[PDB]
Amino acid sequence: GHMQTNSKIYIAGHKGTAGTALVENLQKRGFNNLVLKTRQELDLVNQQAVAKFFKEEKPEYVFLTAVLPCGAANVAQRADFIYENLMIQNNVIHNSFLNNVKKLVFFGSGYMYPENAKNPLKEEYLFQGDLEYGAYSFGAAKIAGAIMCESYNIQYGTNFITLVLNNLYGTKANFDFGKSRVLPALLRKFHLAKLLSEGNITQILQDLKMNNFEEAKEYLHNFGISKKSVEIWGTGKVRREFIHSDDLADVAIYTMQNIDFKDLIKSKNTHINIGTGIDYSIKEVALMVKNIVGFSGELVFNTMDRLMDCSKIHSLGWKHKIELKDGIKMMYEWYKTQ
Amino acid sequence: HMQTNSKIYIAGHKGTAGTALVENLQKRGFNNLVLKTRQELDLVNQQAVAKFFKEEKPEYVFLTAVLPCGAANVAQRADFIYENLMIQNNVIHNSFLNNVKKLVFFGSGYMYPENAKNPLKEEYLFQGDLEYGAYSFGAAKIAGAIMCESYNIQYGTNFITLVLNNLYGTKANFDFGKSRVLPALLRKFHLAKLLSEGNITQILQDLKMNNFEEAKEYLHNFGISKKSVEIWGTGKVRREFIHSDDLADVAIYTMQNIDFKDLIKDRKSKNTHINIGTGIDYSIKEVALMVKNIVGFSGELVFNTTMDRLMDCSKIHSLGWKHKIELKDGIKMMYEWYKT
Ligand SMILES: NC(=O)c1ccc[n+]([C@@H]2O[C@H](COP(=O)([O-])OP(=O)(O)OC[C@H]3O[C@@H](n4cnc5c(N)ncnc54)[C@H](OP(=O)(O)O)[C@@H]3O)[C@@H](O)[C@H]2O)c1
Ligand SMILES: NC(=O)c1ccc[n+]([C@@H]2O[C@H](COP(=O)([O-])OP(=O)(O)OC[C@H]3O[C@@H](n4cnc5c(N)ncnc54)[C@H](OP(=O)(O)O)[C@@H]3O)[C@@H](O)[C@H]2O)c1
Ligand SMILES: [Mg+2]
Ligand SMILES: [Mg+2]
Ligand SMILES: [Mg+2]
Numbered sequence: 254g255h256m257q258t259n260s261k262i263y264i265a266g267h268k269g270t271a272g273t274a275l276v277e278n279l280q281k282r283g284f285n286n287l288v289l290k291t292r293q294e295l296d297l298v299n300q301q302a303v304a305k306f307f308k309e310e311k312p313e314y315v316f317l318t319a320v321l322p323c324g325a326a327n328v329a330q331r332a333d334f335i336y337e338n339l340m341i342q343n344n345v346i347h348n349s350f351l352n353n354v355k356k357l358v359f360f361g362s363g364y365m366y367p368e369n370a371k372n373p374l375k376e377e378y379l380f381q382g383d384l385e386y387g388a389y390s391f392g393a394a395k396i397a398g399a400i401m402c403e404s405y406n407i408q409y410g411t412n413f414i415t416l417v418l419n420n421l422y423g424t425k426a427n428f429d430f431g432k433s434r435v436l437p438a439l440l441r442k443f444h445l446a447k448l449l450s451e452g453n454i455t456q457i458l459q460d461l462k463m464n465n466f467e468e469a470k471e472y473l474h475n476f477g478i479s480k481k482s483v484e485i486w487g488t489g490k491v492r493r494e495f496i497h498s499d500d501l502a503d504v505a506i507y508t509m510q511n512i513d514f515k516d517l518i519k520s521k522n523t524h525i526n527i528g529t530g531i532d533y534s535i536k537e538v539a540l541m542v543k544n545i546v547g548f549s550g551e552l553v554f555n556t557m558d559r560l561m562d563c564s565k566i567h568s569l570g571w572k573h574k575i576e577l578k579d580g581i582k583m584m585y586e587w588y589k590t591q
Numbered sequence: 592h593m594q595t596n597s598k599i600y601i602a603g604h605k606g607t608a609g610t611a612l613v614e615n616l617q618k619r620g621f622n623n624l625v626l627k628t629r630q631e632l633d634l635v636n637q638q639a640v641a642k643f644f645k646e647e648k649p650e651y652v653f654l655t656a657v658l659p660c661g662a663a664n665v666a667q668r669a670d671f672i673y674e675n676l677m678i679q680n681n682v683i684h685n686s687f688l689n690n691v692k693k694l695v696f697f698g699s700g701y702m703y704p705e706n707a708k709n710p711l712k713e714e715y716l717f718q719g720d721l722e723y724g725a726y727s728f729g730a731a732k733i734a735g736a737i738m739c740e741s742y743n744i745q746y747g748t749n750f751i752t753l754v755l756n757n758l759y760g761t762k763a764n765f766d767f768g769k770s771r772v773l774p775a776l777l778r779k780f781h782l783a784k785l786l787s788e789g790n791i792t793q794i795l796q797d798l799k800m801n802n803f804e805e806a807k808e809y810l811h812n813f814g815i816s817k818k819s820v821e822i823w824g825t826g827k828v829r830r831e832f833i834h835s836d837d838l839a840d841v842a843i844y845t846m847q848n849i850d851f852k853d854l855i856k857d858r859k860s861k862n863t864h865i866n867i868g869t870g871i872d873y874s875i876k877e878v879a880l881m882v883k884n885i886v887g888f889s890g891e892l893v894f895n896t897t898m899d900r901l902m903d904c905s906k907i908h909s910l911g912w913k914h915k916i917e918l919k920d921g922i923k924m925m926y927e928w929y930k931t
Contacts, residue, residue: 299637300636300637300638300677301637301638329745330745331741331744331745332687332738332741332742332744332745332746333745334741335734335737335738335741336680336683336684336738336741336742339676339680339734339738340637340680343673343676343677343680346673347673350669367717379720380704380717380719380720380721381719381720382717382718382719383716383717383718383861384717386861389737389861390737390741393733393734393737394734396730396733397672397676397730397731397734400672400726400727400730401669401672401673401676404668404669404671404672404673404727405669407668407669408666408667408668408669408670409669519723521720521723521726
């Protein structure tokens, strides 16, 4: 149980999804001594500013959540994904070493694993084939971050642990059209399809912030939403897994308190996959959302699988608490209040 | 491309490749060079590197600076990845920010899978795990290559990675236990010869030592004696070598002739690094006999009973460069300088 009530804990990237979940869960657990810096206060690409922060604040524990994330919308930023993430990683990990940080947790992505690797993905599949093209430079940076943690642990006897996940979600999602991730996008589609099937024209106009029902029906049809059906743009066979941000926070804190480099060690692949151990076809996710929202209509289909093997984290005494059905239900309850 | 009055930065100019580039550029009239020692410019320090690029505005960059991975320093596993990532990231990003026209970076064969087929094609990147000792160094070299290519794709830069296995050259680093295989082999046979000719004085001056009993036990433990040079292994281990004049030639040829657009012409926009080399490897027996004959050592070669590595240089040949220095000729050039 390494971290104590008054241990100084730095959560890097604290305004992000994982960072917000860590701050909330640490405060609930009674951790009273968090240090938090916005991007405007501390640019983690700038070595001079990061070295100064560590020398002047001397945090004891570090959760490194800050990232330039690689997504469909920003995939053109191929150089930024490698440069900015290597700089964040290098500046935080090295200055943590220089200032005698006790322990650090870093987060990897399943983009670090080969595109053609077998599911479920084992930690030892690192370097067993080429990465997916769009996320190639991002995944290469995450590999370097994992190797940076292990290499410091070996040379300098640091305690820097890498946890690797595929897809993070939480209750308070972004539900904006063409800007929303898979679960929130499906939730909103099914909610609006339900409102259409119930003739709640008034609630449709409120939801879309529109003033003309003919215009609203056109807009909904363009997004495959109708009284009788929701269109899934795909075959429905793409598989997806999910981890709730409260489960990410739980396993990150569990790792900080219990899982040391000692416990993991020609030693290599000392990163640890995290997840729920189960995935879902987009068809299965859609039917689950449909059922939770209570839409009486049909799916219609219109046309890289990633599942972590969680054997290692299970063996080290953590498992997830939040099943996807309960996460989607919490997300929908939140949706209705906003 | 580069003009003789173009401002050219050679990073790491005191190293083997950097010294060869400085000399070969001067010999061709490229005299507008900017050169910084480690004391003048610590390339790990982002602030200092950003200031250098903003002050000096080099037009062309040869990035040769490295923390090298060898048998002796293999414990420095964190340093290999941190220091080299910082050098790479600081020079490549600040080159982009300051409108450098073209950059050449050097990779290592340690960026290829340990068990990849010889000869190694560029496309064997990420086709299996790296050799354990050089794992973190090879990962840093991969990130260097991907950093160049990713800048070329996103920003339209012209940053080219050339990858080699073993460098030697006229003005080489002859320090013992640096895993500088060919320079050290040349030195091992030279000292064996000095012992054979009974030249205590030159042994002590070469080793910069004082006591001959201690010079001897130093030498005997590197397998150096008056009667023999003893090498650990079977004699069958194969290695490829490139002379630093050939490295300088292909680096300058790349600047003058090879642009990113040439590397994605009827090729995928991936694995755009280029292997360089002579395309030929040798057993340690064959190299040791070459060295023995050039040094004129009259004693024995003895083998006392690591994986073969050879580049496929088809792509650089297709782009219009091939090596000029055959190994025997290059070792002769290196020995002549060594004796000077
Ligand atoms: N979300 C996922 O599905 C997913 C999947 C796999 C892996 N992961 C990994 O999990 C970790 C957490 O991801 P996340 O989704 O929580 O990230 P996120 O929501 O995108 O948050 C990233 C945070 O980092 C901050 N940041 C980025 N660059 C910075 C810089 N130069 N200086 C200071 N702060 C900077 C951002 O600040 P601003 O708010 O000011 O921009 C933001 O608050 C990352 O390592 C990520 O790669 C996430
Ligand atoms: N040599 C080989 O067999 C071989 C094989 C494959 C690849 N390569 C690659 O080819 C390139 C050239 O290698 P090389 O053997 O010529 O190199 P080298 O002889 O080892 O020289 C490296 C130079 O970089 C300088 N340097 C290192 N860190 C620095 C820092 N923080 N700030 C400023 N200068 C710094 C060193 O300065 P100091 O002298 O002050 O320490 C040194 O002069 C490298 O990219 C290398 O990895 C070489
Ligand atoms: Mg314990
Ligand atoms: Mg000026
Ligand atoms: Mg041309």
